């Protein structure tokens, strides 16, 4: 429900086909929150303030 | 006595049962009603 299944796992099984049909249409409904991932790109503190 | 005494059910037929339900529609008493002729 956060990372879609294998492209062959969604042709034997059902659920893998459903989650495939939702991950790549809607998404996966993160909860509400907020972060600051500061990452050292070669320039520096590459930041992302998700909300 | 060492002899089975329920052999009469050998010579029964398809209508044996319901013919007795018919004979037992005379001894019986009238049945209730919901008021409705049926639940429609």
């Amino acid at each position: 429900k956060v990372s879609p299944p294998k492209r062959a796992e969604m042709k034997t099984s059902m659920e893998s086909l459903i989650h495939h049909f939702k991950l790549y249409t809607e998404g996966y409904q993160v909860p509400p929150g907020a972060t600051y991932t500061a990452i050292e790109a070669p320039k520096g503190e590459f930041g992302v303030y998700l909300v | 006595t060492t002899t089975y005494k329920n052999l009469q059910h050998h010579d029964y037929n398809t209508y044996t049962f319901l013919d007795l339900n018919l004979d037992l529609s005379k001894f019986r008493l009238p049945q209730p009603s919901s008021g409705r002729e049926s639940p429609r």
């Binding site: - | 919901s34 008021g35 409705r36 639940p39 429609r40």
Partner: protein, 87 residues
């Protein structure tokens, strides 16, 4: 039967001309202020926001369904008429 896409107070606007592109078939427009949802949490917060920006509101009130007495046993009544069939 999902009723969580309710519970907000979106402020959609009127629709306008959507002409089919002569080249291609695409629906094209000139009014950008058409795909314009804005989610709120209360009616008192919405009219205070559209009066502000000069827009003209038109409210339609909430529609909650009734609570309804639902017994599994009324399907199995002697007198009543809810006596179901197909179990």
């Amino acid at each position: 039967s999902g009723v969580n896409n309710t519970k907000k107070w979106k402020m959609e606007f009127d629709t306008r001309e959507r002409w089919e592109n002569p080249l291609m078939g695409w629906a094209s427009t000139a009014d950008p202020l058409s795909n314009m949802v804005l989610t709120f949490s209360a009616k008192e917060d919405a009219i205070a926001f559209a009066e502000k920006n000069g827009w003209s509101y038109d409210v339609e009130e909430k529609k909650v369904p009734k609570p309804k007495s639902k017994s599994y046993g009324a399907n199995f009544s002697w007198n009543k008429r809810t006596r179901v069939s197909t179990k």
